[PDB]
Scaffold this active site. Structure first.
Site, PDB file in Angstrom:
ATOM      1  N   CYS B 105       0.850  -1.185   0.000  1.00  0.00           N
ATOM      2  CA  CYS B 105       0.000   0.000   0.000  1.00  0.00           C
ATOM      3  C   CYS B 105       0.889   1.239   0.000  1.00  0.00           C
ATOM      4  O   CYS B 105       1.711   1.423   0.907  1.00  0.00           O
ATOM      5  CB  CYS B 105      -0.963   0.026   1.197  1.00  0.00           C
ATOM      6  SG  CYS B 105      -1.985   1.534   1.220  1.00  0.00           S
ATOM      7  N   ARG B 108      -0.066   4.702   2.782  1.00  0.00           N
ATOM      8  CA  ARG B 108      -0.009   4.511   4.222  1.00  0.00           C
ATOM      9  C   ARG B 108       0.437   5.747   5.005  1.00  0.00           C
ATOM     10  O   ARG B 108       0.556   5.631   6.230  1.00  0.00           O
ATOM     11  CB  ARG B 108       0.901   3.333   4.566  1.00  0.00           C
ATOM     12  CG  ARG B 108       0.335   1.991   4.182  1.00  0.00           C
ATOM     13  CD  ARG B 108       1.313   0.916   4.567  1.00  0.00           C
ATOM     14  NE  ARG B 108       2.338   0.665   3.554  1.00  0.00           N
ATOM     15  CZ  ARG B 108       3.481   0.039   3.797  1.00  0.00           C
ATOM     16  NH1 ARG B 108       3.750  -0.400   5.030  1.00  0.00           N
ATOM     17  NH2 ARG B 108       4.353  -0.162   2.802  1.00  0.00           N
ATOM     18  N   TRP B 277      -9.150   6.208  -1.051  1.00  0.00           N
ATOM     19  CA  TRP B 277      -9.420   6.845  -2.341  1.00  0.00           C
ATOM     20  C   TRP B 277      -8.395   6.378  -3.372  1.00  0.00           C
ATOM     21  O   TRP B 277      -7.376   5.771  -3.033  1.00  0.00           O
ATOM     22  CB  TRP B 277      -9.395   8.382  -2.280  1.00  0.00           C
ATOM     23  CG  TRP B 277      -8.205   8.965  -1.579  1.00  0.00           C
ATOM     24  CD1 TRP B 277      -6.978   9.180  -2.097  1.00  0.00           C
ATOM     25  CD2 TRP B 277      -8.148   9.385  -0.213  1.00  0.00           C
ATOM     26  NE1 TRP B 277      -6.141   9.726  -1.144  1.00  0.00           N
ATOM     27  CE2 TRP B 277      -6.839   9.860   0.026  1.00  0.00           C
ATOM     28  CE3 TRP B 277      -9.088   9.412   0.834  1.00  0.00           C
ATOM     29  CZ2 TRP B 277      -6.433  10.354   1.264  1.00  0.00           C
ATOM     30  CZ3 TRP B 277      -8.693   9.919   2.070  1.00  0.00           C
ATOM     31  CH2 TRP B 277      -7.370  10.381   2.276  1.00  0.00           C
TER      32      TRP B 277
HETATM   33  C1  HEM Z   1      -6.503   6.472   1.517  1.00  0.00           C
HETATM   34  C2  HEM Z   1      -5.870   6.394   0.344  1.00  0.00           C
HETATM   35  C3  HEM Z   1      -5.217   5.074  -0.127  1.00  0.00           C
HETATM   36  C4  HEM Z   1      -4.443   5.038  -1.200  1.00  0.00           C
HETATM   37  C5  HEM Z   1      -4.074   6.276  -2.068  1.00  0.00           C
HETATM   38  C6  HEM Z   1      -4.000   3.678  -1.385  1.00  0.00           C
HETATM   39  C7  HEM Z   1      -3.150   3.231  -2.379  1.00  0.00           C
HETATM   40  C8  HEM Z   1      -2.887   1.928  -2.717  1.00  0.00           C
HETATM   41  C9  HEM Z   1      -2.384   1.435  -3.989  1.00  0.00           C
HETATM   42  C10 HEM Z   1      -2.052   2.311  -5.218  1.00  0.00           C
HETATM   43  C11 HEM Z   1      -2.259   0.106  -3.888  1.00  0.00           C
HETATM   44  C12 HEM Z   1      -1.810  -0.863  -4.990  1.00  0.00           C
HETATM   45  C13 HEM Z   1      -3.133  -1.317  -5.576  1.00  0.00           C
HETATM   46  C14 HEM Z   1      -3.032  -2.080  -6.865  1.00  0.00           C
HETATM   47  O1  HEM Z   1      -2.115  -1.815  -7.695  1.00  0.00           O
HETATM   48  O2  HEM Z   1      -3.930  -2.950  -7.077  1.00  0.00           O
HETATM   49  C15 HEM Z   1      -2.706  -0.301  -2.561  1.00  0.00           C
HETATM   50  C16 HEM Z   1      -2.740  -1.561  -2.029  1.00  0.00           C
HETATM   51  C17 HEM Z   1      -3.231  -1.871  -0.761  1.00  0.00           C
HETATM   52  N1  HEM Z   1      -3.796  -1.016   0.165  1.00  0.00           N
HETATM   53 FE1  HEM Z   1      -3.883   0.976   0.066  1.00  0.00          FE
HETATM   54  N2  HEM Z   1      -4.548   2.901  -0.372  1.00  0.00           N
HETATM   55  C18 HEM Z   1      -5.316   3.725   0.429  1.00  0.00           C
HETATM   56  C19 HEM Z   1      -6.057   3.283   1.515  1.00  0.00           C
HETATM   57  C20 HEM Z   1      -5.980   2.042   2.132  1.00  0.00           C
HETATM   58  C21 HEM Z   1      -6.676   1.636   3.337  1.00  0.00           C
HETATM   59  C22 HEM Z   1      -7.646   2.573   4.075  1.00  0.00           C
HETATM   60  C23 HEM Z   1      -6.334   0.345   3.624  1.00  0.00           C
HETATM   61  C24 HEM Z   1      -6.765  -0.572   4.805  1.00  0.00           C
HETATM   62  C25 HEM Z   1      -7.281  -0.088   5.955  1.00  0.00           C
HETATM   63  C26 HEM Z   1      -5.387  -0.068   2.597  1.00  0.00           C
HETATM   64  C27 HEM Z   1      -4.752  -1.288   2.469  1.00  0.00           C
HETATM   65  C28 HEM Z   1      -4.144  -1.752   1.312  1.00  0.00           C
HETATM   66  C29 HEM Z   1      -3.769  -3.116   1.060  1.00  0.00           C
HETATM   67  C30 HEM Z   1      -3.938  -4.303   2.026  1.00  0.00           C
HETATM   68  C31 HEM Z   1      -3.223  -3.178  -0.161  1.00  0.00           C
HETATM   69  C32 HEM Z   1      -2.707  -4.458  -0.838  1.00  0.00           C
HETATM   70  C33 HEM Z   1      -3.883  -4.912  -1.703  1.00  0.00           C
HETATM   71  C34 HEM Z   1      -3.503  -6.156  -2.442  1.00  0.00           C
HETATM   72  O3  HEM Z   1      -2.320  -6.565  -2.354  1.00  0.00           O
HETATM   73  O4  HEM Z   1      -4.375  -6.749  -3.111  1.00  0.00           O
HETATM   74  N3  HEM Z   1      -5.211   0.984   1.724  1.00  0.00           N
HETATM   75  N4  HEM Z   1      -3.076   0.835  -1.895  1.00  0.00           N
HETATM   76  C1  LIG Z   2      -8.386   0.563  -0.226  1.00  0.00           C
HETATM   77  C2  LIG Z   2      -7.778   0.760  -1.616  1.00  0.00           C
HETATM   78  C3  LIG Z   2      -7.237   1.989  -1.990  1.00  0.00           C
HETATM   79  C4  LIG Z   2      -6.690   2.146  -3.279  1.00  0.00           C
HETATM   80  N1  LIG Z   2      -6.167   3.312  -3.654  1.00  0.00           N
HETATM   81  N2  LIG Z   2      -6.679   1.137  -4.176  1.00  0.00           N
HETATM   82  C5  LIG Z   2      -7.191  -0.073  -3.833  1.00  0.00           C
HETATM   83  C6  LIG Z   2      -7.205  -1.149  -4.891  1.00  0.00           C
HETATM   84  C7  LIG Z   2      -6.621  -2.478  -4.508  1.00  0.00           C
HETATM   85  C8  LIG Z   2      -7.072  -3.456  -5.585  1.00  0.00           C
HETATM   86  N3  LIG Z   2      -6.020  -4.449  -5.756  1.00  0.00           N
HETATM   87  C9  LIG Z   2      -6.074  -5.116  -7.067  1.00  0.00           C
HETATM   88  C10 LIG Z   2      -6.133  -6.438  -6.334  1.00  0.00           C
HETATM   89  F1  LIG Z   2      -7.175  -7.187  -6.642  1.00  0.00           F
HETATM   90  F2  LIG Z   2      -4.966  -7.065  -6.392  1.00  0.00           F
HETATM   91  C11 LIG Z   2      -6.293  -5.687  -5.027  1.00  0.00           C
HETATM   92  C12 LIG Z   2      -7.757  -0.275  -2.557  1.00  0.00           C
END
Ligand code: HEM
Ligand SMILES: Cc1cc(N)nc(CCCN2CC(F)(F)C2)c1
Ligand code: HEM
Ligand SMILES: C[C@H](O)[C@H](O)[C@H]1CNc2nc(N)[nH]c(=O)c2N1
Ligand SMILES: C[C@H](O)[C@H](O)[C@H]1CNc2nc(N)[nH]c(=O)c2N1
Ligand SMILES: Cc1cc(N)nc(CCCN2CC(F)(F)C2)c1
Ligand SMILES: [Cl-]
Ligand SMILES: [Cl-]
Ligand SMILES: [Gd]
Ligand SMILES: [Gd]
Ligand SMILES: [Zn+2]
EC number: 1.14.13.39
Lengths: 401, 401
Positions: B105, B108, B277
């Site tokens: 993520c 964070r 978002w």
């Molecule tokens: C608030 C703005 C947030 C932004 C800008 C953001 C951004 C991102 C991005 C760009 C990714 C990679 C996603 C992808 O390429 O599929 C990601 C993954 C992830 N985010 Fe964040 N996120 C946010 C909020 C959160 C929140 C609120 C949580 C949990 C409480 C979270 C937990 C995670 C997790 C667990 C992943 C890994 C998902 C996966 O591996 O499938 N995120 N995030």
């Molecule tokens: C909370 C949140 C924020 C963000 N900015 N973006 C995401 C997308 C994560 C989707 N990921 C593709 C997958 F299926 F591997 C999980 C989630």
């Protein structure tokens, strides 16, 4: 027990049985992954038997008279001398295999086409310079670049060694000022200081080609002015942005790495420069736009009258694309071999499929194969990769100081 | 203690938090698998003990009366019942730490700002749906998005799990076609087939919002249509290319992942959807330009009059840049929170500095942190990173079908 590798664009799966041959342990442990980090007596018989078996398997001659024979003479050479000499054909095979094993090279589709110059009877920096100069003009070839590696003498105990003190055979200078900052290339401000210290008059230019510092064993290095006719360079201009030419940018034709230790059959060659041809993001994205390199990004953006007041205008992304366009356009009009990152990664995907059939897999460093612009627009982005160390190999080594 | 360099600045830190990494990862000293996407009361006790230690450290009461009370209490309840129950304050800290610990993520910097909805008293799929509708409404907040998680009852001996069958709360359908193709989002063909199989009447658009399939313990999944006016969507237009609005493209405001398992002190919540978002590249680059997703890149470059016959014109890169421009401008026009990859990676750099001062390191998966375009233009490209697993954690889980 055999890593499952997926391609997420197509959904195909392969298995990397080849990884079972990983020799020199890598940096990663079950506790943590360290893949993103850049720089993470008779043992010579194990490394030699394995290499010689490699040679003969690859000419369908495993386990037949000539294989046994070659096994005994290296046995008896090291027995008598504590080391051994490679046959010409072996060293050729060793050079091409090290390239083939380089996990960070995206251009290995070419690994089988490699011109190997043997400088093993070299002595003194006066001859070094000539061996390097033969290579450079051969590789440059008036712009039709050809891959080449020159191999200076190997390493023996109780004696100093051959080293090229520069990272590459062609590098621009880096000069501090009354304010610390740099005119020229900031990557080479160290070796630039050594050349000035060793008797070279500093220049006044952003693009002064540094002099070589070559080291014969146990003797102090000597400066060498490279022949300017031998150093083919490309002025940078853009196809439609007429002002781009005015920014006075150049880069050189021949990327020739001169600081890595070739390792074949347990033998070490601290000087063994290899050269290929550039992929354009190397020059346009990394060399010219990295904040710690020429850092030209904002200056191209002012010239394009972009909105640099907000990051969401993606002015960085726009300026960088055109810089790359100018690079490709400039090498082509100058008729110098260069490949763009779409063509290069597509070829690497074809390489991986070849290698899957030939050797059961291919060591690849995802963070280095995926280009530094437009990553997910290339197919390597969606290809899972396995990184490991095979032999023979190119290795990094200390600087001699 | 792994040493970590930033190549843009030269600074060097040591990641001592890595030493505490619990569960093991996919890599060995023989081979790195970092690029792979998907790599007993006494242990429950030990997981719980460590979480409680973490929580009491966070309230500046480590080793106090309240601390031993809780330790002794949890062993008592694990001894009596095989498991235990989190206090509410502990559940808020554990949802926050789980975000904090997520190595992939990039958002964070916000981990402390998280709205925790306790639905652990939920009893049915129907009550589950109301909790989920209230999450979407709060988080969306009319385009001014707020980060939230809703936490449904934990896995326990005797009863099946709550599960959300959809991978996100908002997803577009993907229908297989008359000539093998997919209309809609090809990532969602499986879950679209499951909705149909469970009584949903499918549409035929490219941007049809999917209904929810909600699983109550020991129940078949139940189908729930989202109220249209609960799903904020954004029509996509380009600030200069006027023909872009006639592509008829949309995306939705709220990214709400709903198929991941939240692990807190050995307890497992298989249903705990969370949302933040978007970063603009997820939509513009991956969702819209991936060859196996909407795959719009060529059609946009054709409209832009780019020359698509040769890769060296960088038509792919130019077309993608404008798609991201279009995403950013459309969400600002609509007044829906969005962050670009330059702002986001720059805030992630601050997160690593804050996290170094506070915990001695920070888990990070480089290949996920670096944006899929303009990688080396962001500062995270030039940052080495250590990847490892901490608890509490969000984990992948198999599909319930
Ligand atoms: C608030 C703005 C947030 C932004 C800008 C953001 C951004 C991102 C991005 C760009 C990714 C990679 C996603 C992808 O390429 O599929 C990601 C993954 C992830 N985010 Fe964040 N996120 C946010 C909020 C959160 C929140 C609120 C949580 C949990 C409480 C979270 C937990 C995670 C997790 C667990 C992943 C890994 C998902 C996966 O591996 O499938 N995120 N995030
Ligand atoms: C909370 C949140 C924020 C963000 N900015 N973006 C995401 C997308 C994560 C989707 N990921 C593709 C997958 F299926 F591997 C999980 C989630
Ligand atoms: C023929 C065309 C070639 C192309 C297009 C090419 C391309 C590349 C690129 C882009 C890299 C990434 C390096 C960086 O970004 O710093 C690389 C790495 C590397 N290549 Fe090649 N290369 C070519 C030829 C060769 C040859 C002939 C050799 C040796 C025989 C070689 C061996 C290596 C090695 C050892 C590395 C790793 C070096 C490092 O990590 O600094 N390549 N190559
Ligand atoms: C820190 C990071 O791993 C490092 O900057 C790497 C990433 N990928 C790279 N890839 C290439 N081709 N060349 C590089 O110098 C780097 N740098
Ligand atoms: C195989 C490869 O690791 C895979 O395509 C990854 C690379 N990095 C990624 N990074 C992010 N943020 N999201 C992704 O889906 C992926 N995909
Ligand atoms: C043979 C070769 C081909 C190519 N196309 N490009 C290179 C670049 C090597 C420069 N690398 C930066 C470093 F110093 F790390 C070494 C080498
Ligand atoms: Cl270079
Ligand atoms: Cl998404
Ligand atoms: Gd002007
Ligand atoms: Gd226009
Ligand atoms: Zn690893």
């Amino acid at each position: 027990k055999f890593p499952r590798v997926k391609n997420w664009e197509v959904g195909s799966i392969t298995y990397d049985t080849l990884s079972a041959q990983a020799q020199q342990d890598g940096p990663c442990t079950p506790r943590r992954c360290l893949g993103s980090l850049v720089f993470p007596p008779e043992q010579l018989l194990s490394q030699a038997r394995d290499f010689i078996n490699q040679y003969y398997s690859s000419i369908k001659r495993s386990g037949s008279q000539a294989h046994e024979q070659r096994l005994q003479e290296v046995e008896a050479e090291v027995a008598a001398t504590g080391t051994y000499q490679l046959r010409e054909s072996e060293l050729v095979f060793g050079a091409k295999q090290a390239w083939r094993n380089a996990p960070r090279c995206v251009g290995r589709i070419q690994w089988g086409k490699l011109q190997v110059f043997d400088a093993r009877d070299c002595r003194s920096a006066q001859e070094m310079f000539t061996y390097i100069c033969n290579h450079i003009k051969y590789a440059t070839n008036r712009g039709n670049l050809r891959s080449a590696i020159t191999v200076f003498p190997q390493r023996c105990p109780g004696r100093g060694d051959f080293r090229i003190w520069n990272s590459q055979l062609v590098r621009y200078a880096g000069y501090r000022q009354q304010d610390g900052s740099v005119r020229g290339d900031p990557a080479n401000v160290e070796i630039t200081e050594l050349c000035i210290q060793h008797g070279w008059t500093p220049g006044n230019g952003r693009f002064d080609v540094l002099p070589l510092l070559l080291q014969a064993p146990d003797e102090p290095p000597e400066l060498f002015l490279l022949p300017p006719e031998l150093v083919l360079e490309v002025p940078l201009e853009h196809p439609t942005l007429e002002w781009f030419a005015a920014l006075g940018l150049r880069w050189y034709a021949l990327p020739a790495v001169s600081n890595m230790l070739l390792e074949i059959g347990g033998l070490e060659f601290p000087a063994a420069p290899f050269s290929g041809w550039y992929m354009s993001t190397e020059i346009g994205t990394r060399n010219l736009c990295d904040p710690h390199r020429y850092n030209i990004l904002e200056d191209v953006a002012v010239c394009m009258d972009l909105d640099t007041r907000t990051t969401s205008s993606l002015w960085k992304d726009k300026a960088a694309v055109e810089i790359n366009v100018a690079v490709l356009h400039s090498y082509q009009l100058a008729k110098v071999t260069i490949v763009d990152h779409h063509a290069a990664t597509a070829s690497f995907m074809k390489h991986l499929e070849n290698e899957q059939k030939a050797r059961g897999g291919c060591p690849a460093d995802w963070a280095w194969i995926v280009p530094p612009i437009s990553g997910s627009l290339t197919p390597v982005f969606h290809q899972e990769m396995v990184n490991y160390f095979l032999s023979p190999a190119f290795r990094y080594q200390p600087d001699p100081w």
